[PDB]
């Protein structure tokens, strides 16, 4: 390289053997992405069939206990462990895999290896984009999934008491974590969360409208009703009538796109902005900084017994959520709340 | 924050709208 002799060495041989066409691309990033992702998926799929949560959360979270797919989960370590990484060699387990499983240490193991797998996947995208030389907007858009992953699996437990409040790897466990933010954090009323949900539903808008519009303003290219074969992989001409699309959306919606490039980039822009703002919101939640109470509305509700609103209904439902959460979701608090102190309405 | 909200919302509206309007008329002035 650089018109100098460049005698081939171990690095050169490794690069030449690594960046080449295969069924699965290895490259340099495969030194981390393949083992880390393999370990993460293996640990999770092992946890949803084997790992009992009876000693971590005191629950059932695998098929070995009779759970189904949703209720099966790789469960978080106990809050008494704090923010320990729970090494199998470390003081928690000290080389004993069998009781390292009962400690919930594979939660931290799989979360760590999955973070490194996300890093390796982004590095694989970057390495492929370097190998065959086009812009890495896939990695630019992929910057948001890793932001979500960090902000909800590491930032939130590190801000809170420990990994126990972190989400567990499993669909019903994610549902538990979601209702946990609904009750404790009022995550629906969080501004950054509304930023994110607006961005994601707008991403669904752009994806659906772009696919439908492209498939509905197509040129002829036909003499056959199956328009899929109307496209040729090697052609330098448009396949769908964009000017017709612009007129249709200008007369239907009032505004329309005048550029394919800006259209596609805004399609990229909406979900990455939504996920990044959601990540910032859960980062704000990580230190018990919520959009929970509207001060003026709660004041006027306090000095007005008739002033009922949907916001106050949500607030009251959230302390009801938390009052029912504490006892059966926080064993390490051993909150033996009696039946009478539980808030409830008439009848039911 | 009854009227601190007023002044904050006012400046949050003002600074980007004046900025965007200035650069837009810079664009539109040159044809």
């Amino acid at each position: 390289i650089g018109t100098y002799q460049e005698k081939r060495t171990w690095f050169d041989d490794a690069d030449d053997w690594l960046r080449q066409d295969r069924f699965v691309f290895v490259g340099w990033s495969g030194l981390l992405l393949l083992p880390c992702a393999y370990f993460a998926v293996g640990g999770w799929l092992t946890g949803c069939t084997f790992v009992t949560s009876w000693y971590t959360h005191g629950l059932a979270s695998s098929y070995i206990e009779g759970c189904n797919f949703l209720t099966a989960a790789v469960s978080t370590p106990a809050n008494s462990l704090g923010h320990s990484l729970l090494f199998v060699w470390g003081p928690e387990a000290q080389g004993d895999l069998t009781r390292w499983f009962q400690l919930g240490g594979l939660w931290a193991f799989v979360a760590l290896h999955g973070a490194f797998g996300l890093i390796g996947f982004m590095l694989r995208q970057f390495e492929i984009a370097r190998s065959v030389n086009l812009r890495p907007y896939n990695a630019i858009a992929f910057s948001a999934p890793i932001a979500v992953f960090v902000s909800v699996f590491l930032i939130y437990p590190l801000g809170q008491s420990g990994w126990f409040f972190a989400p567990s790897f499993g669909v019903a466990s994610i549902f538990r974590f979601i209702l946990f933010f609904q009750g404790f954090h009022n995550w629906t009323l969080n501004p950054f969360h509304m930023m994110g949900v607006a961005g994601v539903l707008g991403a669904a808008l752009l994806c659906a409208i772009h696919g439908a519009t492209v498939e509905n303003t197509l040129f002829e290219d036909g003499d056959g009703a199956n328009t899929f074969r109307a496209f040729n992989p090697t052609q330098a001409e448009e396949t769908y009538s964009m000017v017709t699309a612009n007129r249709f959306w200008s007369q239907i919606f009032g505004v329309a796109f005048s550029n394919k490039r800006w259209l596609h980039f805004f399609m990229l822009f909406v979900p990455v902005t939504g996920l990044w703002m959601s990540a910032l919101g859960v980062v704000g939640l990580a230190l018990n900084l919520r959009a929970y109470d509207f001060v003026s509305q709660e004041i006027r509700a306090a000095e007005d017994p008739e002033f009922e609103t949907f916001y106050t209904k949500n607030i009251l439902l959230n302390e009801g959520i938390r009052a029912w959460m504490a006892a059966q979701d926080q064993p390490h608090e051993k909150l033996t709340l009696p039946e009478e102190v539980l808030p409830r309405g008439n009848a039911l | 924050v009854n009227i601190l909200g007023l002044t904050a919302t006012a400046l949050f509206i003002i600074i980007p709208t004046s900025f965007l309007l200035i650069l837009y008329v810079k664009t539109a002035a040159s044809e």
Partner: peptide, 30 residues
């Protein structure tokens, strides 16, 4: 006082929707 601000900024939002709909940049066929 807050109701005036809410109403004014929301009617401004819908008015600029109207402005972007009708008084938009006309695209060119060239």
């Amino acid at each position: 006082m807050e109701a005036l601000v809410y109403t004014f900024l929301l009617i401004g939002t819908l008015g600029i929707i109207f402005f972007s709909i009708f008084f938009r940049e006309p695209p060119r066929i060239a």
